[PDB]
Amino acid sequence: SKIIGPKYRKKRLTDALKERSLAFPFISTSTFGFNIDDATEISANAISEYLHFHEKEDDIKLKMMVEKSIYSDNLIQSFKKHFNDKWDKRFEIIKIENSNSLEQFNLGCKLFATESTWRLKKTPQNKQLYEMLDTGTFEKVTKNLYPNCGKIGKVYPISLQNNKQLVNSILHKEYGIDIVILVLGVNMNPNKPDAFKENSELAKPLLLETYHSLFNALDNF
């Protein structure tokens, strides 16, 4: 759970099969209940940090999936403000109806991130994803790779490719996903595991570290 920060790596020439195209949620904002003003600033700033560092790397495509309820003109303006009116062409926000909507899966990204918990198991919010992967198969592969389970602020990539049991998933074969990344963002919701208290001094630092971890995974990926 120790904070490690960004470990980003510039790549000018890349393998098209290893393109850094990531679909990811607006971490901790819906079910987890993270303060949206705070999540917006952290998200926008982390995104801009990564994209600026990687100026001129055109393989990178970032698609942030935002639930309809949270999506607003004010939200988009807030992002614009953090980007100093220079919104990077490589970053898009995609409105989805809810965390289980089918529209989220065919966005053309080789890496697909989902929120998870320490258990690294299916949640009610990513049920649809897990049905598509086959729950038992994916959970078994997850447990084999990460036998000591997950820590808040970290991500856990699982390849659908090198993974024999998952290669035939619609997610891989039809929707072009190579890697599913389980993202352990900060939960603020008393009804979900490992809830942080409202003014925890660790909440903001750990959400940022979640983004760093995610983008570190992308740069390896």
Kindly tell me the burial class for residue 213, based on how many C-beta atoms sit within 10 Å of its own C-beta (0-12, 13-18, 19 or more).
buried
Distance CA 89, CA 93 (A): 11
Going by C-beta distance under 8 Å and a sequence separation of 6 or more, which residues neighbour residue 113? 22, 23, 24, 25, 155, 180, 181, 182, 183, 214
Contact (Cβ atoms closer than 8 angstroms) between residue 101 and residue 126 = no
Residue 64 and residue 130: Cα distance in Å, rounded? 20
Rounded Cα distance, 188 and 183, in Å: 15
Non-local (6+) Cβ contacts of 25 within 8 A are 64, 65, 66, 99, 113, 114, 115, 183
Neighbours of 192 (CB within 10 A): 16
Do 40 and 208 meet the contact criterion of CB atoms below 8 Å apart? no
- For 109, residues 6+ apart whose C-beta sits below 8 A from its C-beta are 21, 22, 23, 61, 63, 176, 177
Secondary-structure breakdown of the chain: helix, strand, coil percentages, each rounded to the nearest 5: 35, 15, 50
Instruction: Report d(CA 105, CA 99) in Å as an integer.
Output: 11
Q: Which two tokens stand for residue 3?
A: 């904070």
Q: Which helix (H) or strand (E) holds 49?
A: helix 36-53
The full DSSP string for 51-83 is HHHTTT-TT-EEEEEEETTT--HHHHHHHHHHT
Nearest to 45 by CA among 91, 108, 10: 91
Residues of 116-137 as b/e, b for ≥16 C-beta within 10 angstroms? bbebbbbbebbebbbebbeeeb
β-pairing, 111-115 with 155-159?
Answer: unpaired
The rounded distance, in Å, linking the Cα atoms of 168 and 93 is 29
Which of 156, 208, 182, 214 has the alpha carbon at shortest distance from 20?
214
SS3 25: strand
Q: DSSP secondary-structure letter at 113?
A: E
> In 3-state terms, what secondary structure has residue 91?
strand
Cβ distance 112 to 23 under 8 Å?
Answer: yes
